[PDB]
Design a protein around this ligand. Sequence first.
Ligand SMILES: CNC[C@@H](O)c1ccc(O)c(O)c1
Ligand SMILES: [Fe+3]
Length: 308
Amino acid sequence: TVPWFPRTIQELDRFANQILSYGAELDADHPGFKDPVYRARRKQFADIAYNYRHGQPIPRVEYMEEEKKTWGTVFKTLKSLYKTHACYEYNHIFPLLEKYCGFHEDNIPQLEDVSQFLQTCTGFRLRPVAGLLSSRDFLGGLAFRVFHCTQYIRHGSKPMYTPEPDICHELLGHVPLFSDRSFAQFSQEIGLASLGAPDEYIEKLATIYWFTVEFGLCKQGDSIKAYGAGLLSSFGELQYCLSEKPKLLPLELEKTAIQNYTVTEFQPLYYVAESFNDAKEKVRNFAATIPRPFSVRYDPYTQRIEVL
Ligand SMILES: CNC[C@@H](O)c1ccc(O)c(O)c1
Ligand SMILES: [Fe+3]
């Protein structure tokens, strides 16, 4: 029968008891696997996320010198590429994040301050996430303009590498785009399309998310730039995605939804969005093809989903 989905923003609290309990930091393959301090530190952030409840301010954390150093390295190395490789919406908001959110090499921004900033721009808010959420729950949060965000940082031994999202990827990759109104509406449409959708369609929406929010390219006049969070947080792939090597195709959802992708090497192909308004329209039409015995609408005045 129709899978359960949250109907009010507070119901997202139900997700904490539905994450993958054995995280990536437990794999012998993880850069911090042999480091017990790192291990304990990850558990500390997981407990903060576990006890968090909608409406509370997100707990502030004092990062260690070693963690600030890793942030600094990532920030400084990536920043040199944005003016030439990132889509206009990213560069338009970055200076404001540097001024009101403390995006600077010597300081890791606190999620509460960043969340307040997003609320003022587009009403998006962040909530700390323990471990891995199912695609269903992750996408469902977007329907409420809620982005589940990691608060921990990657292990210091390999600053330019992370096998999972971490705070550098969330803040330098995702946050700037969520401050844009059209991108915010586009992300929310993916979320609304996921509510109560059958498992096989959630996987199609997760793939569309991968080829837009995480690895999307924008058409900007006669040029092509990156807006994908996975590209904006990867020094190597951000330079590669705008070279002659990858194959670029126009975003066509019937096609993007079933395309296979690798999570371990640079993407061999990327989809180019005409604009976020256009991508939003395409998702809305795609959503109409999803078999759901009902229709949904979000009411921002009450923060509830209306089931039609
Ligand atoms: C929890 N869903 C899949 C996960 O690998 C995932 C999802 C969304 C992201 O933005 C991301 O960087 C990683
Ligand atoms: Fe991400």
